[PDB]
Amino acid sequence: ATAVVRCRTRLARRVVAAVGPDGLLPAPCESRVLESALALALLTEERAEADATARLTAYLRTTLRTAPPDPFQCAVARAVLGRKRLMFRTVLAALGATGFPAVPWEAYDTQSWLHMEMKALKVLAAHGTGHPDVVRDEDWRALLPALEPGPAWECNNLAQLLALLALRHSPRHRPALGDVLKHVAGRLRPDGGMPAIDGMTVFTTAAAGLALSLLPAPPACVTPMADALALRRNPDGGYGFHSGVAQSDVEDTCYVLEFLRRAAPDRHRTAVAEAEGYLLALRNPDGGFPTFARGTSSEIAMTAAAASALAHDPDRREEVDEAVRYVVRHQRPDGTFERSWSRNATNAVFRAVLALTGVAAHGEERRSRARAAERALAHLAATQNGDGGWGHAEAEPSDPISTAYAVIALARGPRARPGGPLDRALAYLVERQHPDGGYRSRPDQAGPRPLLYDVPALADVFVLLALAHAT
Ligand SMILES: CC(C)=CCC/C(C)=C\CC/C(C)=C\COP(=O)(O)OP(=O)(O)O
Ligand SMILES: [Mg+2]
Numbered sequence: 001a002t003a004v005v006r007c008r009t010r011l012a013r014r015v016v017a018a019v020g021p022d023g024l025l026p027a028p029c030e031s032r033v034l035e036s037a038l039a040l041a042l043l044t045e046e047r048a049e050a051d052a053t054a055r056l057t058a059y060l061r062t063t064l065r066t067a068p069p070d071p072f073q074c075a076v077a078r079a080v081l082g083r084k085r086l087m088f089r090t091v092l093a094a095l096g097a098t099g100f101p102a103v104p105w106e107a108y109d110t111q112s113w114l115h116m117e118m119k120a121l122k123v124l125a126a127h128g129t130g131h132p133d134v135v136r137d138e139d140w141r142a143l144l145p146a147l148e149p150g151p152a153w154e155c156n157n158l159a160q161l162l163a164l165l166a167l168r169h170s171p172r173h174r175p176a177l178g179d180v181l182k183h184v185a186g187r188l189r190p191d192g193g194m195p196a197i198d199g200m201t202v203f204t205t206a207a208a209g210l211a212l213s214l215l216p217a218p219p220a221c222v223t224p225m226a227d228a229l230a231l232r233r234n235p236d237g238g239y240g241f242h243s244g245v246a247q248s249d250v251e252d253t254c255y256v257l258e259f260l261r262r263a264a265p266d267r268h269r270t271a272v273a274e275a276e277g278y279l280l281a282l283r284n285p286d287g288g289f290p291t292f293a294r295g296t297s298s299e300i301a302m303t304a305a306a307a308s309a310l311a312h313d314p315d316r317r318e319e320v321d322e323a324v325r326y327v328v329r330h331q332r333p334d335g336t337f338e339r340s341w342s343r344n345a346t347n348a349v350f351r352a353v354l355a356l357t358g359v360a361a362h363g364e365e366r367r368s369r370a371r372a373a374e375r376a377l378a379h380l381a382a383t384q385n386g387d388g389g390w391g392h393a394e395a396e397p398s399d400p401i402s403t404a405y406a407v408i409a410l411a412r413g414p415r416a417r418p419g420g421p422l423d424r425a426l427a428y429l430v431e432r433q434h435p436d437g438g439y440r441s442r443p444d445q446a447g448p449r450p451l452l453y454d455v456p457a458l459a460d461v462f463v464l465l466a467l468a469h470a471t
């Protein structure tokens with residue numbers, strides 16, 4: 001057929017091959033400078049795990065020299081080798097690089113993940129400013145999961161590392177420190193670094209399952225993939241980003257729900273209904289959806305994702321319509337929406353356009369939604385790079401993941417024409433395919449925002465999702 005279909009075919013073979021017999025696509029996270037630096041600081045202060053601290057030191061020096069991250073992580077690394085503003089400043093102050101914020105202690109009180117990180121930073125600031133008496137027993141109590149053996153609580157190495165840097169100041173918690181330092185030291189990757197998270201296999205398996213389910217003839221492996229996801233659902237009916245993550249989130253749950261609706265709607269009928277229930281219980285009064293917890297602010301990409309995921313059930317048409325109306329209201333004067341968990345402009349455009357064009361609509365609302373979708377697709381056309389791709393921002397060089405999101409959106413516009421934006425984007429993706437069938441991309445996932453972390457398995461998965469939508 002076409003060079004695009006040949007590309008799609010080679011990539012689908014690669015993704016299918018990567019799925020294991022347990023139904024999961026492995027999705028390890030690369031080493032990250034922030035967690036590596038905090039681990040070095042911790043092990044160094046405790047005079048522990050000499051072999052690991054030397055590997056961490058060499059990892060940080062190499063990375064700073066060859067592939068330096070953002071300026072904040074660079075400053076963290078240099079400090080150890082030699083609300084977000086509150087958190088990041090307090091991290092640097094704990095490492096001796098700047099002064100502690102002169103804020104009331106209540107400034108630190110607040111994710112269950114963010115809550116633990118901010119309590120740990122509160123303790124570090126109390127001790128660092130010479131006021132250890134300020135720390136209350138409820139502050140220490142929040143940190144107790146960091147003393148449990150095994151992988152980090154919620155697969156979150158930042159939260160455990162900060163908690164342990166705080167807890168090593170408390171005499172009544174130190175008996176438990178030795179054992180957990182051994183398992184922290186045991187997490188180093190082959191390059192000597194500490195990954196941000198244990199992995200992202202639930203998110204990655206769900207997105208890949210969805211992409212495979214959009215192919216003309218989905219592979220047999222979608223069934224064990226669907227099985228592997230459904231048996232990992234949390235009690236509230238939602239999904240976390242990796243095995244062992246108790247805090248469900250809207251983004252993971254929408255990808256799982258979208259996948260199960262296509263590949264296993266009867267086999268996994270109860271998980272499907274529980275995932276819809278999870279989303280509906282989170283819905284905010286304004287018709288939007290938060291990321292984790294009701295009462296926190298609606299977000300555009302989460303609202304669009306939930307609109308599309310719920311649209312399958314005609315019984316939910318009223319909540320879907322209110323979510324799409326929310327998307328229309330929040331479009332910016334230049335046709336864009338607003339980032340978040342992705343650091344590129346194209347992620348929220350792709351979610352918004354799918355919501356604006358999937359939910360069938362007629363009359364005035366059809367015209368309102370069509371105008372919004374056109375402005376967003378026009379923003380993509382206006383910002384497309386000369387090589388046919390998109391970057392993280394309008395003046396950034398193209399990358400396959402940012403381009404994949406734009407392709408998914410453009411596949412909802414008018415048909416590709418020779419030399420048009422969608423045609424040129426697909427040619428860009430065809431040209432970036434590696435001999436082994438895969439894609440390498442700058443990562444787009446952030447957390448804590450805006451700090452990037454790198455799960456390389458996602459590049460293949462999102463490019464396949466784009467090619468499955470566009471063909
Ligand atoms: C599934 C995925 C694509 C959605 C992104 C959110 C997801 C559930 C994981 C984020 C990664 C996290 C473990 C690192 C800290 O992020 P953080 O949540 O603490 O970041 P924040 O402080 O800015 O809120
Ligand atoms: Mg956080």
Ligand SMILES: [Mg+2]
Pocket residue numbers: 113114156158159447448
């Ligand atoms: Mg975190």
